[PDB]
Design a binder for this molecule. Structure first.
Ligand SMILES: Cc1cc2nc3c(=O)[nH]c(=O)nc-3n(C[C@H](O)[C@H](O)[C@H](O)COP(=O)(O)OP(=O)(O)OC[C@H]3O[C@@H](n4cnc5c(N)ncnc54)[C@H](O)[C@@H]3O)c2cc1C
Ligand SMILES: Cc1cc2nc3c(=O)[nH]c(=O)nc-3n(C[C@H](O)[C@H](O)[C@H](O)COP(=O)(O)OP(=O)(O)OC[C@H]3O[C@@H](n4cnc5c(N)ncnc54)[C@H](O)[C@@H]3O)c2cc1C
Lengths: 482, 482
């Protein structure tokens, strides 16, 4: 159609927030969002990855597996539930998918009510102020605007040089939509996406195995990541440490013949699974954009979009947000706010910039891992072991006592500066409702909380989070942390 | 026996902490703890109210009822659990009680290892440096010490002028130990003790009714308390608003004939219940102390012990801690720390005082209510409506969506100062894992967090606590909070 004050490419977490805000600021906004299906042929509605194949489905299926543990615990507190309790993938999927759809329609209604022309068209630049797009039936349509915002996020990544890879494998995109149970599954990866999925899969009774080339959750505090995987294998998830896939052969039975190199024992083993999921990192969606045709530089290694402290780029009126923006953390909350504030800066008269420092997060694994601030190792790198004090503790959730469920791995460590009052650099929590616990402490770090203040902060008894506040044993002291 | 550097009357939350610390400071400590049974004849081990008839049993039975909701939700996520699932009080009680005992022995072992002579003797003063006590078989025993610490807490309170009261009623002390299901129960009270108990009782399938003379949770933010009870009656708990008991008659069937005045409708109705629990406030245990024989002044109204900012009293070497200390909040964490720090001050060389300001708390009702800082109403009283801004929101836990369980009452309000950056005065959370959520924010308030900082604090998605950080709609604005 004609032009708009603002045009947003990608109707997901970041983009939709930018549009809705701009639209709320009395500006004529337009958004184009197209869901190029997955190799396996999966596709979905408006809302981006988080809504359709990310946070939501993941968290809800995790909730499913958790409930399974809840039913065991149930009998300990007096609930005479017939223990031989099966779980069927169809019901769960049905339920999760329907909610996902509520969000699709929920967004369209929000875009309609704020009046934002929605073009389900996959964009690509032609010049510096215009884009061209195709649709379901494939037909061009001229679109331009003064300001443009790229919020195209990314997509899973397939392995290079692995026959059978595309032809038979599936990704995080396909799993939340499978029509029938994945049956026996092999998850290839060490990212949080990998761990979380094998986790709830194990939770719902599936034979699951994680294949890791090297270390777990690269990027996160290693001691905690270590504790996470240890909890997993101690509770059903099978692990293939130090292994890489080389090829997959489908059997006349339709099963998958996964062959691999085991760099930690022999040198090549093989297994048979019903599903093989590749969780090996994502790739920014810039390929199709023709960013070159618009003069928007991007960093070579990670095909992201180089950006300003104002999410700006090569061109002064073109901005990048979310998974595509280099440096920016791949989280839904940051993209939402970043884009929302960007709208505020453009036609809202605000001068506030997005602040990606100390962003709390939580990996939703069987035993949840929530953290905010510096990694221990990360802390000594910036200050030196000499100026860092680390308080830690193994604790036991009251609820775990009567349910008689293992408390190992329920560990908490708080990284502070050694000199008083000892500013807190990072907090790490491993246990039930980790995200629920970490959140509040994030405000503590954004405010500059100190260990001195932590000690003067009474706990809510009885709870797991109070343990965070009861921490007194440093690692330097050498004392037993239990 | 002979004297000790420190003598502690009452081996519970506050006292045991004081002793263990003093004992750890190389001082010879002694503690006397006697559990004068309840009118109904219930009694227990070392550890105080929290361990035996408070936080622990309460929280675990609450956990029981919660699991019941968890089993319903279970079917929605695909868990084919045979819905007609009964719950039996015997198993639960057995399980909860055994854990309670672990704490009894757990404490004795800690007192043995730190070497603290334990005299299961109910004390009473004779002079200013000595006490006299009786035991199981009742036999005196001379005990003195330079410093004395009174940590005798309190005990339930029976109604005055209500025939049938003692003869048939039970208290928070008796419920956690009942040998057989309470059957149909009537809870008389509006304190958190009252609500929490009728709550898990309803949770485990019992016909429960709360009888309230007037308002709920006097002392707490009224809007939130209102929301709490509303959630309860919307989910099984029956309410008798504006009623007072006048007499109880036992029927030849052993049931209880509760007669009462209904100041909100007729003027006198009657009901029949299996159990009647009086949750109408506690009373400090000073009666038996002969505080007069030692010259320790106490405030008339609340028979507590008047104290210094150092938990000191009339006499310079006698200190009071916990439920007996006037002004001090009746919580386990405060008593623990207060007593621990007191030890640090005496023979530890510390000059730090206990800080009872902004203590977070959480009432464990069907739908949990966690809060810290000022009550809204409390805030306008100290600053004036004119200088207070209140942000609020109704939200829906992701997990509630697929389980299809009502989100009403899931409300969050944050009371701040109106002038920027808008210091936060109090935070109120109503929903799942309230204590888990509130804790962290307590550190935020102890640090002086501001709403400006709250807005710059990214949330962990998806979680309930992130809602706390997403708050943007003020009450002044008049806008819809959903
Ligand atoms: C398995 C998994 C689990 C996750 N769990 C969490 C979690 O618990 N918490 C959390 O905070 N984050 C989580 N994330 C990450 C989160 O979903 C992303 O950080 C967030 O979606 C990024 O937002 P975005 O707006 O940048 O892009 P996206 O939400 O990915 O949206 C981009 C949109 O643009 C479309 N598009 C792409 N190219 C074009 C084009 N050329 N033309 C038109 N449209 C185009 C896409 O198809 C899509 O609809 C998870 C991710 C995965 C994969
Ligand atoms: C139903 C209920 C639920 C609760 N839930 C919570 C909760 O979730 N969280 C929380 O933080 N708090 C909770 N509390 C309150 C908490 O238990 C108290 O605040 C805490 O126990 C007070 O500690 P204390 O050391 O002062 O006294 P107590 O723990 O009460 O200990 C006093 C001890 O001294 C003994 N004693 C008394 N008089 C004498 C004497 N003359 N000679 C010798 N010994 C004597 C007593 O028998 C007892 O063993 C709850 C209370 C109740 C009643």
């Amino acid at each position: 159609q004609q032009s708009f004050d603002l045009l947003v490419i990608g109707g997901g977490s970041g983009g939709l927030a930018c549009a809705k805000e701009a639209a709320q600021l009395g500006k004529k906004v337009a958004v184009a969002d197209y869901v190029e299906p997955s190799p396996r042929g999966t596709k979905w509605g408006l809302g981006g990855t988080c809504v359709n194949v990310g946070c939501i489905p993941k968290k809800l299926m995790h909730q499913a597996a958790l409930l399974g543990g809840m039913i065991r615990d149930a009998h300990h507190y007096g609930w005479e539930v017939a223990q031989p309790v099966q779980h069927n993938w169809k019901t769960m999927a049905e339920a999760v998918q329907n909610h996902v759809k509520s969000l699709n329609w929920g967004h369209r209604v929000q875009l309609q009510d704020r009046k934002v022309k929605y073009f389900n068209i996959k964009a690509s630049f032609v010049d510096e102020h215009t884009v061209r797009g195709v649709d379901k039936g494939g037909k061009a349509t001229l679109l331009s605007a003064e300001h443009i915002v790229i919020a195209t996020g990314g997509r899973p990544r397939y392995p290079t040089q692995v026959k059978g890879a595309l032809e038979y494998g599936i990704t995080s995109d396909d799993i939340f939509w499978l029509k029938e149970s994945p049956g026996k599954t092999l998850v290839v990866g060490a990212s949080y996406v990998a761990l979380e999925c094998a986790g709830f899969l194990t939770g719902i009774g599936l034979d699951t195995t994680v294949m890791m080339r090297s270390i777990p959750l690269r990027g996160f505090d290693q001691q905690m990541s270590s504790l996470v995987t240890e909890h997993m294998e101690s509770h059903g998830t099978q692990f293939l440490k130090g292994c890489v896939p080389s090829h997959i052969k489908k059997l006349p039975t339709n099963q998958l013949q996964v062959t691999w190199e085991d760099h930690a024992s022999g040198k090549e083993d093989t297994g048979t699974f019903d599903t093989v999921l590749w969780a090996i990192g994502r790739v920014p969606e810039t390929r199709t954009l023709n960013l070159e045709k618009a003069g928007i530089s991007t960093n070579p290694k990670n095909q992201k979009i180089i950006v300003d402290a104002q999410e700006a780029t090569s061109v002064p009126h073109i901005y990048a947000i979310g998974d595509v923006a280099e440096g920016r953390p791949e989280l839904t909350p940051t993209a939402i706010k970043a884009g929302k504030l960007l709208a505020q800066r453009l036609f809202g008269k605000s001068s506030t910039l997005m602040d990606y420092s100390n962003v709390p997060t939580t990996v939703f694994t069987p035993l949840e891992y929530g953290c905010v601030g510096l990694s221990e190792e990360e802390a000594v790198a910036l200050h030196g072991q000499e100026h860092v004090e680390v308080y830690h503790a193994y604790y036991k959730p009251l609820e775990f006592t009567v349910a008689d469920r293992d408390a190992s791995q329920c560990y908490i460590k708080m990284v502070c500066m050694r000199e008083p009052p000892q500013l807190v650099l990072g907090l790490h929590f491993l246990g039930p409702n980790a995200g629920e616990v970490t959140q509040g402490f994030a405000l503590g770090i954004k405010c500059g909380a100190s260990y001195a203040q932590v000690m003067q902060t009474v706990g809510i008894h009885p709870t797991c989070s109070e343990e965070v506040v009861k921490l007194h044993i440093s690692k330097r002291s050498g004392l037993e942390p239990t």
